[PDB]
Amino acid sequence: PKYTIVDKETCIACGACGAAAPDIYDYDEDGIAYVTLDDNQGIVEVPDILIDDMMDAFEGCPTDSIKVADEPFDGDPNKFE
Ligand code: SF4
């Protein structure tokens, strides 16, 4: 499976990821992206049909703030660093 999460500390509120994958990423009041599937906890598996959109958003993020993994993040966007 695949899991995703936003490191909100490095996000620059550019708007690209919600356009590339609107069913996965949205923005808080401050314009900072988060994963709507699981309230940015990195615990809900991304549906198979959405993986291509997720990878588009991941590759397109200017500051490498979107994370992807094959194992849950359990709330920590920096788990795999
Ligand atoms: S693409 Fe990256 S920097 Fe831009 S809003 Fe999404 S997470 Fe933030």
UniProtKB/Swiss-Prot annotation:
- What domain of life does the UniProt record list for this protein's source? Bacteria
Q: Which cofactor does it need?
A: [4Fe-4S] cluster
Q: Name one GO molecular function term.
A: 4 iron, 4 sulfur cluster binding
Q: For binding [4Fe-4S] cluster, which residues are annotated in this chain's numbering?
A: 11, 14, 17, 61
Supply the PROSITE patterns for this chain: 4FE4S_FER_2
Record keywords: 4Fe-4S, Electron transport, Iron, Iron-sulfur, Metal-binding, Transport
> Which part of the chain is the 4Fe-4S ferredoxin-type domain?
2-30
| Pfam annotation, one family | Fer4_13
Keyword Coiled coil assigned:
no
Q: How is the cofactor bound?
A: Binds 1 [4Fe-4S] cluster.
Q: What does this protein do?
A: Ferredoxins are iron-sulfur proteins that transfer electrons in a wide variety of metabolic reactions.
Please identify the protein, giving its name as recorded.
Ferredoxin
This protein's species is Bacillus thermoproteolyticus
